[PDB]
């Protein structure tokens, strides 16, 4: 199975450098080129460059001077490094592989790396419970959740019961508060009679600050 796995999301300061690693498996870098493509918030895709099987590289015109792609065939690792980043460069960066060695139909993609370019600093979230109660049982169904507040930069990962609870989960787009920090909610609806025998845990992970918190959410009254 062909796969590309990228390094974690993170904050980069204006004028500084961006570096991402794409580790591939299921194929050899000596036989396929690996391309890089980015996607700006609520925008389209923009091809940035590629390092071919033999090691040659091609960069899209706008990046010719501030981008360099290298690799370690033995480690199956591809290195992306771009210089002098501006706000404008905030985006999700993907590495990808085409169907054939010399082509550009991208059949395989990494999971993307969200890079935020801001002068601010990284901050981990606070996780608070969104607890049901007598006044939270909609026809035997209750809603509960976690409020992941005051973190930066994006993103944050939220799962429930270590991934075993997916049905009825809704994790909302984060909002930027006037404080310049994000806040996100994730909820799930469950039978109100299960609030006694089943435990509900939101698992949140804010990789930029290496913060992991498992929060149990129970009604208060």
């Amino acid at each position: 199975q062909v796969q590309l796995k990228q390094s974690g999301p993170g904050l980069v300061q204006p004028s500084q450098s961006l570096s991402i690693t794409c580790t591939v498996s299921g194929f050899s870098l000596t036989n396929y080129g690996v391309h890089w493509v980015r996607q700006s918030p609520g925008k389209g895709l923009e091809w940035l460059g590629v390092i071919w099987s033999g090691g040659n590289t091609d960069y899209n015109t706008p990046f010719t001077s501030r981008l360099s792609i290298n690799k370690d065939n033995s480690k199956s690792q591809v290195f992306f490094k771009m210089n002098s980043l501006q706000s404008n460069d905030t985006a999700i960066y993907y590495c990808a592989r085409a169907l054939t060695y010399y082509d550009y139909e991208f059949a395989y993609w990494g999971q993307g790396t969200l890079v935020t370019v801001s002068a601010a600093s990284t901050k981990g979230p606070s996780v608070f419970p969104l607890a049901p109660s007598s006044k939270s049982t909609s026809g035997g169904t209750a809603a509960l959740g976690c409020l992941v507040k005051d973190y930066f930069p994006e993103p944050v990962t939220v799962s429930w019961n270590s991934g075993a609870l997916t049905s009825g989960v809704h994790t909302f787009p984060a909002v930027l508060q006037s404080s310049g920090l994000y806040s996100l909610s994730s909820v799930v609806t469950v039978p109100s009679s299960s609030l006694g025998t089943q435990t509900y845990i939101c698992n949140v992970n804010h990789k930029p600050s290496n913060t992991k918190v498992d929060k149990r959410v129970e009604p208060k009254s």
């Binding site: 895709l45 993907y94 139909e105 608070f128 994790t171 909302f172």
Partner: protein, 213 residues
């Protein structure tokens, strides 16, 4: 560079219908066009290559056509799970470029939100601020209105909301609204209410709680 123009910007359709996305190239590019699907928080997924060639693992309902400058991605009998952004890419001329995409939306019958209100936790109160949250679950259409009232005073400017993408299975939306107050203002009032209005409700639905009770 070759500019690809995709239309319409938003394509709204009902399940079972045949749908078609347009991608027009700024110059002739032969059949050098590839199409991708991109679901919420997902990476692009290759659907068709070279205008019409199929890719392994892609549902038969997807097909592509076109030659020259006008290309079409087609979905015969669209399904609720097809909700996503769709993009075309040309590679007849370096550098390869992509369209700005067309977002596919699925129509469905009106459905009223189920509403829940959540008081701030004591843990957060210790921090000096109180977040009060209102959830509007699984409704359609997307348009909905949340009004926050504290001891009956309408709140304005201290709330923020976000809405999920259409659910891949039932085509509904959910909305989360957060009212933010300082601990001082929160402790000065009693009745906290979230009132929502929506096409699917005959009259507004309000959920509330009394601080402390």
């Amino acid at each position: 560079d070759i500019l690809l123009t995709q239309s319409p910007v938003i394509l709204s359709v009902s399940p079972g219908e045949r749908v078609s996305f347009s991608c027009r190239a700024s110059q002739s590019i032969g059949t050098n066009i590839h199409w991708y699907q991109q679901r919420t928080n997902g990476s692009p997924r290759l659907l068709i290559k070279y205008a019409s060639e199929s890719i392994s693992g892609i549902p038969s309902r997807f097909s592509g056509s076109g030659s020259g400058t006008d290309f079409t991605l087609s979905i015969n009998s669209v399904e609720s799970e097809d909700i996503a952004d769709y993009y075309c890419q040309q590679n007849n001329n370096w550098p390869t470029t992509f369209g700005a995409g067309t977002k596919l939306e699925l129509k469905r019958t009106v459905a009223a939100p189920s509403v829940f209100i959540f008081p701030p936790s004591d843990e957060q109160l210790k921090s000096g601020t109180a977040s009060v949250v209102c959830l509007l679950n699984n409704f359609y259409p997307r348009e909905a209105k949340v009004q926050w009232k504290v001891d009956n005073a309408l709140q304005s400017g201290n709330s923020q909301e976000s809405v999920t993408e259409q659910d891949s299975k039932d085509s509904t939306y959910s909305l989360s609204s957060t009212l933010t107050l300082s601990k001082a203002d929160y402790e000065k009032h009693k009745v906290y209410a979230c009132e929502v209005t929506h096409q699917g409700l005959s009259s507004p639905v309000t959920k509330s709680f009394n601080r402390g009770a």
